[PDB]
């Protein structure tokens, strides 16, 4: 439930980070 939904929301943002520094 909220575990996969939570960690998931967290994963997306973690991508954005490495996606801005990584391009």
Curated annotation (Swiss-Prot):
<comment type="function">
    <text>Component of N-methyl-D-aspartate (NMDA) receptors (NMDARs) that function as heterotetrameric, ligand-gated cation channels with high calcium permeability and voltage-dependent block by Mg(2+). NMDARs participate in synaptic plasticity for learning and memory formation by contributing to the long-term potentiation (LTP). Channel activation requires binding of the neurotransmitter L-glutamate to the GluN2 subunit, glycine or D-serine binding to the GluN1 subunit, plus membrane depolarization to eliminate channel inhibition by Mg(2+).</text>
</comment>
<protein>
    <recommendedName>
        <fullName>Glutamate receptor ionotropic, NMDA 1</fullName>
    </recommendedName>
</protein>
<feature type="intramembrane region" description="Discontinuously helical">
    <location>
        <begin position="7"/>
        <end position="17"/>
    </location>
</feature>
<comment type="subunit">
    <text>Heterotetramer; the NMDAR subunits are modular and harbor tiered domains that function in concert to regulate opening and closing of the cation-selective ion channel pore. Forms heterotetrameric channels composed of two GluN1/zeta subunits (GRIN1), and two identical GluN2/epsilon subunits (GRIN2A, GRIN2B, GRIN2C or GRIN2D) or GluN3 subunits (GRIN3A or GRIN3B) (in vitro). Can also form heterotetrameric channels that contain at least two GluN1 subunits and at least two different GluN2 subunits (or a combination of one GluN2 and one GluN3 subunits) (in vitro).</text>
</comment>
<feature type="region of interest" description="Pore-forming">
    <location>
        <begin position="5"/>
        <end position="23"/>
    </location>
</feature>
<comment type="similarity">
    <text>Belongs to the glutamate-gated ion channel (TC 1.A.10.1) family. NR1/GRIN1 subfamily.</text>
</comment>
């Amino acid at each position: 439930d909220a575990l996969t939904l939570s960690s998931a929301m967290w994963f997306s943002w973690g991508v954005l980070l490495n996606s801005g520094i990584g391009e």
